[PDB]
Scaffold this active site. Structure first.
Site, PDB file in Angstrom:
ATOM      1  N   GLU D  49      37.741  -8.997  10.688  1.00 52.35           N
ATOM      2  CA  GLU D  49      39.103  -8.356  10.737  1.00 52.35           C
ATOM      3  C   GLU D  49      38.873  -7.770  12.162  1.00 52.35           C
ATOM      4  OE1 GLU D  49      42.983  -8.783   9.684  1.00 52.35           O
ATOM      5  OE2 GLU D  49      41.043  -9.654   8.412  1.00 52.35           O
ATOM      6  N   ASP D  60      47.260   3.359  10.878  1.00 59.20           N
ATOM      7  CA  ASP D  60      45.636   3.706  11.123  1.00 59.20           C
ATOM      8  C   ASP D  60      45.659   5.071  11.167  1.00 59.20           C
ATOM      9  OD1 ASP D  60      44.597   1.044  11.211  1.00 59.20           O
ATOM     10  OD2 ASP D  60      45.492   0.720  13.098  1.00 59.20           O
ATOM     11  N   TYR D 175      45.377  -9.526   0.773  1.00 63.35           N
ATOM     12  CA  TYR D 175      44.831  -7.923   0.898  1.00 63.35           C
ATOM     13  C   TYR D 175      45.189  -7.061  -0.124  1.00 63.35           C
ATOM     14  CZ  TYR D 175      43.067  -4.492   4.201  1.00 63.35           C
ATOM     15  OH  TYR D 175      42.325  -3.298   4.805  1.00 63.35           O
TER      16      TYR D 175
HETATM   17  O1  LIG Z   1      38.212   1.256   6.230  1.00 58.45           O
HETATM   18  P1  LIG Z   1      39.718   1.750   6.447  1.00 58.45           P
HETATM   19  O2  LIG Z   1      40.363   2.394   5.359  1.00 58.45           O
HETATM   20  O3  LIG Z   1      39.843   2.395   7.710  1.00 58.45           O
HETATM   21  O4  LIG Z   1      40.459   0.149   6.877  1.00 58.45           O
HETATM   22  C1  LIG Z   1      40.352  -0.444   7.737  1.00 58.45           C
HETATM   23  C2  LIG Z   1      41.775  -0.874   8.520  1.00 58.45           C
HETATM   24  N1  LIG Z   1      41.719  -2.134   8.976  1.00 58.45           N
HETATM   25  S1  LIG Z   1      42.599  -3.343   8.831  1.00 58.45           S
HETATM   26  O5  LIG Z   1      42.627  -4.182   9.599  1.00 58.45           O
HETATM   27  O6  LIG Z   1      41.784  -3.552   7.500  1.00 58.45           O
HETATM   28  C3  LIG Z   1      44.037  -2.920   8.151  1.00 58.45           C
HETATM   29  C4  LIG Z   1      44.912  -3.537   7.227  1.00 58.45           C
HETATM   30  C5  LIG Z   1      46.090  -3.172   7.018  1.00 58.45           C
HETATM   31  C6  LIG Z   1      46.682  -2.120   7.700  1.00 58.45           C
HETATM   32  O7  LIG Z   1      48.066  -1.416   7.488  1.00 58.45           O
HETATM   33  C7  LIG Z   1      48.627  -2.217   6.661  1.00 58.45           C
HETATM   34  F1  LIG Z   1      48.281  -2.190   5.495  1.00 58.45           F
HETATM   35  F2  LIG Z   1      49.947  -2.003   6.464  1.00 58.45           F
HETATM   36  F3  LIG Z   1      48.856  -3.611   7.146  1.00 58.45           F
HETATM   37  C8  LIG Z   1      45.899  -1.373   8.714  1.00 58.45           C
HETATM   38  C9  LIG Z   1      44.671  -1.763   9.136  1.00 58.45           C
END
Ligand SMILES: O=P(O)(O)OCCNS(=O)(=O)c1ccc(OC(F)(F)F)cc1
Ligand SMILES: O=P(O)(O)OCCNS(=O)(=O)c1ccc(OC(F)(F)F)cc1
Ligand SMILES: C=C(/N=C/c1c(COP(=O)(O)O)cnc(C)c1O)C(=O)O
Ligand SMILES: C=C(/N=C/c1c(COP(=O)(O)O)cnc(C)c1O)C(=O)O
Ligand SMILES: c1ccc2[nH]cnc2c1
Ligand SMILES: c1ccc2[nH]cnc2c1
Ligand SMILES: c1ccc2[nH]cnc2c1
Ligand SMILES: c1ccc2[nH]cnc2c1
Ligand SMILES: [Cl-]
Ligand SMILES: [Cl-]
Ligand SMILES: [Cl-]
Ligand SMILES: [Cl-]
Ligand SMILES: [Cl-]
Ligand SMILES: [Cl-]
Ligand SMILES: [Cl-]
Ligand SMILES: [Cl-]
Ligand SMILES: [Cs+]
Ligand SMILES: [Cs+]
Ligand SMILES: [Cs+]
Ligand SMILES: [Cs+]
Lengths: 395, 258, 395, 258
Positions: D49, D60, D175
């Protein structure tokens, strides 16, 4: 001779050099004529409504009286254009000046709310304005200073004497002694020589008139008491005037106790000074044993004045109105209380009045009482003062 | 007040005019002030006008405001002024002595008590700068009861009512105000005489020998000079001081002969 | 699905992470229910009148239009409690929060007028409030900062990103992403995801409704145009909303030109940006060629935002409303002009709207026109900014 | 999207779960990022990802905000990200590659053009963090037209309408959001299978080998881990960096066997 009585019992009069008596007589004549002139009254009402924002709100305080039998309303002169009740009567006096064919304005100020009010009225009505202010005052509300000169007013710091409000007052009479012929002296409180105590009352009495209409609408009865701070006397007599003949309504004026009356660092001549002659009037003064005028003290620049208007001295003498004092620390607590529980930041001057209302509630919390505080201005001008105090403490 | 009446008789008998200087009592000090006052009389002053230091000298401009400040820096109090007055009178039995007061100092301990003290020390007149004729009744009554002349200001543009009241209420001399404003016109003199007013002295701005002869010629009984003397005290703030004021006074009084 | 249309033509929508959609749907449902609830409307009207001071004055400017055929009125939102129009809609949103059973408030602010409005509403109504503000903003209106914490609000400076208003905006959504369950996010302008553009308009539309009643009373007709500054869009749409169907009334929104549009240091995305998706909406944005959001610039912190609410983008697209820009120097001149000739110290934000009205008058001084400027706040908060500028120049 | 379907077939054929790490492209640099990504795959990552730096990463938290800042400090632009994607795909033909985008980067130059570029470089899926299913129609349509799986978030408390829409609209993987808030519950997995949803991966907060086996046991097809990898990049900001992430990934993927 005069058209109107210059005295309130033994207090008041016209204790000015002979050279100024024609100016006072002229002003008295213009005022009497204006008061009978519906066109003058229409113009004054228009400015008050459409420019200054009258009528001001009457706000019921829910949170700060919780758990007691006190109902507390605040007459919101803090919402008036300029941020204080000073604006009401400068608009009337500025019209009086124009009625006399005068084109310049002289004013005195300590806190600066009256100088700012003088400058804004003069900017609007085409008058050339100059403002005397104790140079010690110019340093601590530079905000208000810059407001006046943004508005085209000439600001003249005072080095004579203590360099504070009373000194600013003497400069104004000194200048007006120069030529009243072209300038009007826009005195900023209900004090000084006749006719100013009478004029300023009548040009402030809408505070009380509106309060009475609004309390009757919201509660169906008169208040048990109206409470106002007293620097020279204008907002208090403006609150009081329309209730004086409603004998069940208590009239409570609050002088600054400063560091405590027993310290002598205070501004409470009405209850702790004695009668004297100064600033064109016979009235209570803080003075030395041999008759020199003392320096007063208050955390709030706008209450820091060693005398008081003569109508308050008279209302006190006959028992119609009662006067108390509130210390700096008490005023600071009421300031914080209003910010935190009503979301209104009050002038430290008005916080003395608020502090005494809170005392009446807290001392006797099961006493049923309907109270109005004249909230004479907003405290944006004080947040720097309050911050420095709070920082010297902990918090 | 009878000193003024003897002085004016002995000036037109001389075909002369009066020259009356003003100083603030105790400026720049108590002992020093007594020396200036002695030099003023020796240099030829016909009468004195003496200021008691006040916290708020509202009719006084910066020259005499600072005179008051200098006297306050010396610790000068009203009580000590009245000790100075007693010493001045004891040295100068005939010189008319007028006080320039502000209302609160006269009213402070009682109006009658104030004028009683004036009489006890030998003061001849009292001008209260912030009491107009409209407010003057208890002051002039207490003054007359203690043989003190109450002095009144006659402003330049003064109506007939004011001329009559000043003429009837005043004693000793009539203060002819020469301009507006603060310390720093012949048409009225005859009308004052017509109403049997106390003899007129013009003042409030006089600073050189030009004005004196002009006033005497206008039929005014003399002139008063305030800031000019204090400025001379001001210019030389001790030995060269005294010679400076001595020179000034003689030029003024020479001009009152004609 | 939604109860109300989330779009204005192609602009608007709900571009938020899925986790926040229930919160937006909940708010939309509460708003629709409240709008139909006379008891909610009564409570809202009571706060507006008796606490905030509505109706605000409509002031006719005599001096500044002398010698021209322009009649200029100022809708005095500077007289509202708190000193700006921000206060209107926080009172409605705070009631909405209580209607939802929520007890905490999140807000974002750059100039601080909205954070102060959030804090005062929360102080009055018993809500625990926390405010995100770009740390660069906390330094330059420390006055407004201290006002919020005097009122019991938690003030949270922002170090992420540019450390300014947009960064403050992202912190708020970030936090609200944490738990909308107990907190309501009190968005401070007519932008962001649906339902905020709709809610903020309806909670500001009393600006225009009163203006229409008051101009008709004083002039017997509708204005030729109503002019308002546009930071995110609330005071302008609040002015505009009630005139949208009066097709003869021009609707003029003024974006900040900053140092000049050609410099790129400006805040005028509606006319000089292009459509993008950010802050939960599809709307004009200042952005780089590859779709990064740019930093905007305005002398006035409250206009310094690189997007604009979607209803303005739509009103522009169909020609109903026209949008222009006013530079820093032009806004500073109108600020000085109002101080000196009307005795009113306007917010630098509102001075952009004033500057454009003065341009319409000056460019065509014999054109007969009746104009209203939304005077969205007072400029006490700007006198330090204006002083430093004036000092760097001569004068 | 067909890479995901081949991976999931070859994981339950293995009776295994997927471990998918997230890094921001170009953090801490372009050339360096390509080495981290190579180490992640060698250390045992089943899919990737990959975040494209955005000015305003709204979903984020501070860990990945700073990842974006570090990439911007390196001058990393979306165009250069797509050059990196081409190089990653050219080295790793079978590893599914998902992009984490924000809506403005996808919409900027045209939605269809964006997905066309994704297909050209070999991207398998795109998650647009600030586009909910309610707003997703033009994005998922453009994705499917270019053989890109649109990834949708299934929040913890999600109603049946949302479960059905996510099941019908998504491809590649679902997800499974593990909490609220920003980067830094088994009852839904069976219902997703009931509606023939793309296999579920739990993510958004995973930082140690405990959670992975828990998700695989819950019947989830695997797990995603974001900040934990970036923090490891964060902890050692170059040689000791790579060994740190290699160690982390193998522990995660060992846990997916059971
Ligand atoms: O380990 P963490 O908690 O920092 O997660 C990593 C984040 N990277 S990601 O691409 O999965 C990811 C997935 C979803 C996000 O927002 C959304 F849910 F609204 F879509 C943001 C980042
Ligand atoms: O030379 P100048 O102009 O300074 O005059 C000297 C002043 N000393 S004084 O006692 O005559 C004097 C006389 C009158 C005063 O005020 C009043 F007129 F209202 F009464 C003040 C001072
Ligand atoms: C002395 C000044 N202000 C006085 C003041 C006072 C005291 O003045 P009065 O006693 O005349 O109301 C009360 N409230 C406010 C807000 C004030 O500003 C001045 O502005 O010069
Ligand atoms: C951005 C803020 N203020 C904005 C503002 C604006 C611009 O906001 P709207 O476009 O939402 O009216 C206009 N006028 C005043 C007095 C303002 O304070 C703020 O207080 O955070
Ligand atoms: C009216 C006019 C003049 C006065 N003087 C005293 N009382 C009065 C009443
Ligand atoms: C006390 C004294 C004089 C004043 N001028 C204006 N406000 C005042 C308060
Ligand atoms: C009402 C409710 C939902 C809507 N979605 C689009 N337009 C609408 C109108
Ligand atoms: C622009 C953007 C966001 C805002 N929040 C409050 N006022 C604003 C103006
Ligand atoms: Cl009397
Ligand atoms: Cl009126
Ligand atoms: Cl300043
Ligand atoms: Cl006589
Ligand atoms: Cl649409
Ligand atoms: Cl309403
Ligand atoms: Cl501060
Ligand atoms: Cl599917
Ligand atoms: Cs109560
Ligand atoms: Cs006082
Ligand atoms: Cs006009
Ligand atoms: Cs903007």
């Amino acid at each position: 001779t005069t058209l109107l009585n210059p005295y309130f019992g033994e207090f008041g009069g016209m204790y000015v050099p002979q050279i100024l008596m024609p100016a006072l007589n002229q002003l008295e004549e213009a005022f009497v004529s204006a008061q009978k002139d519906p066109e003058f009254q229409a113009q004054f009402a228009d400015l008050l409504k459409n420019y200054a924002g009258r009528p001001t709100a009457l706000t019921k305080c829910q949170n700060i009286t919780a758990g007691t039998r006190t109902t507390l309303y605040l007459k919101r002169e803090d919402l008036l254009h300029g941020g204080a009740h000073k604006t009401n009567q400068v608009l009337g006096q500025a019209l009086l000046a124009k009625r006399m064919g005068k084109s310049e304005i002289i004013a005195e100020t300590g806190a600066g709310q009256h100088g700012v009010a003088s400058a804004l009225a003069s900017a609007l009505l085409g008058l050339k304005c100059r403002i005397y202010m104790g140079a010690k005052d110019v340093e601590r509300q530079s905000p208000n200073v810059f407001r006046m000169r943004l508005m085209g007013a000439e600001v003249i710091p005072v080095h004579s004497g203590s360099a504070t409000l009373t000194d600013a007052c003497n400069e104004a009479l000194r200048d007006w002694s120069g030529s009243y012929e072209t300038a009007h002296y826009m005195l900023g409180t209900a004090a000084g020589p006749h006719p100013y105590p009478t004029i300023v009352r009548e040009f402030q009495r809408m505070i009380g008139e509106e309060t009475k209409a609004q309390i009757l609408d919201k509660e169906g009865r008169l208040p048990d008491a109206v409470i106002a701070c007293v620097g020279g006397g204008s907002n208090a007599i403006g609150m009081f005037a329309d209730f004086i003949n409603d004998t069940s309504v208590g009239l409570i004026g609050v002088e600054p106790g400063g560091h405590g009356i027993e310290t002598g660092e205070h501004g409470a001549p009405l209850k702790h000074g004695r009668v004297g002659i100064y600033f064109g009037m016979k009235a209570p003064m803080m003075q030395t044993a041999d008759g020199q005028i003392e320096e007063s003290y208050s955390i709030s620049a706008g209450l820091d004045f060693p005398s008081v208007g003569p109508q308050h001295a008279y209302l006190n003498s006959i028992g119609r109105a009662d006067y108390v004092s509130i210390t700096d620390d008490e005023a600071l607590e009421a300031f914080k209380t209003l910010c935190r529980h009503e979301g209104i930041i009050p002038a430290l001057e008005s916080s003395h009045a608020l502090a005494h209302a809170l005392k009446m509630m807290r001392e006797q919390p099961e006493k049923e009482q309907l109270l109005v505080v004249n909230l004479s201005g907003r405290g944006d001008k004080d947040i720097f003062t309050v911050h420095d105090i709070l920082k010297a403490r902990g918090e | 007040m009878e000193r003024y009446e003897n002085l004016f008789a002995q000036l037109n008998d001389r075909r002369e005019g009066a020259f009356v200087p003003f100083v603030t009592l105790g400026d720049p000090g108590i002992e020093q002030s007594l020396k200036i006052i002695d030099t003023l009389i020796d240099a030829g002053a016909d009468a004195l006008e003496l200021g008691v230091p006040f916290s708020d000298p509202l009719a006084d401009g910066p020259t005499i405001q600072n005179a008051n400040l200098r006297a306050f820096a010396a610790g000068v109090t009203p009580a000590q002024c009245f000790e100075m007055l007693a010493l001045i009178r004891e040295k100068h039995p005939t010189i008319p002595i007028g006080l320039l007061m502000y209302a609160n100092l006269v009213f402070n301990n009682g109006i009658d008590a104030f004028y009683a003290r004036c009489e006890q020390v030998g003061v001849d007149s009292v001008l209260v700068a912030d009491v107009p004729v409209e407010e003057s009744a208890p002051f002039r009554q207490a003054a007359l009861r203690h043989n003190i002349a109450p002095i009144f200001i006659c402003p330049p543009n003064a109506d007939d009512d004011l001329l009559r009241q000043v003429a009837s209420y005043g004693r000793g001399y009539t203060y002819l105000l020469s301009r507006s404003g603060v310390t720093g016109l012949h048409h009225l003199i005859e009308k004052l005489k017509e109403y049997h007013a106390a003899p007129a002295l013009q003042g409030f701005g006089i600073s050189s020998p030009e004005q004196v002869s002009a006033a005497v010629r206008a039929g005014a009984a003399g002139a008063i000079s305030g800031s000019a003397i204090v400025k001379i005290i001001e210019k030389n703030l001790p030995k060269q001081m005294l010679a400076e004021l001595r020179s000034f006074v003689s030029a003024m009084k020479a001009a009152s002969r004609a």
